[PDB]
Write a protein that binds this ligand. Structure first.
Ligand SMILES: [Zn+2]
Ligand SMILES: [Zn+2]
Ligand SMILES: [Zn+2]
Ligand SMILES: [Zn+2]
Ligand SMILES: [Zn+2]
Ligand SMILES: [Zn+2]
Length: 272
């Protein structure tokens, strides 16, 4: 037990999944901090030194981290791995990124099994002295993820099909909405600098008309104001905050990936 194998991830969700696979035999750190916007994060010099100190770097791919490839050019002799390998992307459906992969694949718990296997495989490949701990921890964590499916569906089972509309600010929930039979509506399709600020807001306020959607949400790394506005101009309650792009701090409501899924579904459910 000298200095432990060091893994650096781009953001907090991957950090928590990887630390569950690593257990005590490896140290997993995230480049972005809890609460920080991850799509257009601007790396600092201290971020370079952190990534350069790693034995292995994990990132999402599906162009989630618009900043990563340019950043990674400053890192030498450190292998990286894309943890969404083998996931089939859902395309973005409107706006200037229409047709690009929707990168929020981790919001489907069945996809998280694929994240887990990609991370396990990378850990075993580059740290083979601990292949037994990594292989045991991954199987145990995959079983925790599989166990979520029944309580999650049961928690949402009081909402009838026609009523299952999920109205959020970022369209970050397409993978979760597909898994649990929700229709998605959103103020913008993916976080970015962009136009369409008030026109999608009026188009969303539209769809809330004929479907009498009762509740709309925001998310933890972006401004809650546009959702709160939509709630004002309609009769819909503001139900947010949902979690997708970041965990909370270790003492906050959402310190782990499992707590992020459970609490996001729980908040949708109570919103209805
Ligand atoms: Zn050891
Ligand atoms: Zn080691
Ligand atoms: Zn490798
Ligand atoms: Zn043993
Ligand atoms: Zn739309
Ligand atoms: Zn996002």
């Amino acid at each position: 037990t000298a200095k432990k194998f060091k893994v650096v991830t781009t953001f907090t969700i991957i950090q928590d999944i990887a630390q569950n696979i690593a257990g005590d035999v490896a140290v997993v750190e995230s480049i972005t901090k809890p609460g920080a916007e991850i799509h257009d994060y601007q790396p600092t010099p201290r971020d370079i030194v952190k990534a350069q100190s790693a034995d292995l770097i994990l990132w999402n791919g599906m162009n989630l981290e618009r900043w990563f490839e340019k950043f990674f050019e400053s890192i030498k002799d450190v292998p990286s791995a894309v943890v969404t390998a083998g996931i089939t992307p859902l395309p973005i459906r409107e706006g200037p990124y229409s047709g690009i992969a929707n990168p929020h694949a981790w919001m489907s718990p069945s996809n998280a099994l694929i994240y887990i296997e990609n991370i396990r495989k990378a850990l075993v490949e580059h740290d083979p002295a601990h292949a037994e701990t990594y292989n045991r921890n991954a199987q145990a964590y995959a079983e925790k993820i599989k166990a979520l499916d029944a309580p999650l569906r049961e928690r949402l089972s009081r909402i009838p099909a026609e009523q299952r509309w999920l109205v959020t600010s970022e369209g970050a929930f397409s993978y979760l909405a597909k898994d649990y039979g929700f229709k998605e509506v959103y103020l913008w399709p993916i976080n970015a600098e962009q136009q369409g600020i008030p026109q999608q807001v009026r188009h969303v306020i539209d769809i809330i008309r004929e479907n009498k959607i009762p509740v709309v949400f925001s998310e933890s790394t972006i401004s809650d104001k546009p959702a709160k506005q939509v709630s004002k101009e309609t009769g819909a309650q503001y139900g947010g905050v949902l979690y997708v792009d970041s965990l909370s701090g270790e003492k906050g409501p959402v310190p782990t990936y499992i707590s992020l899924i459970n609490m996001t579904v729980d908040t949708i459910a109570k919103g209805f």
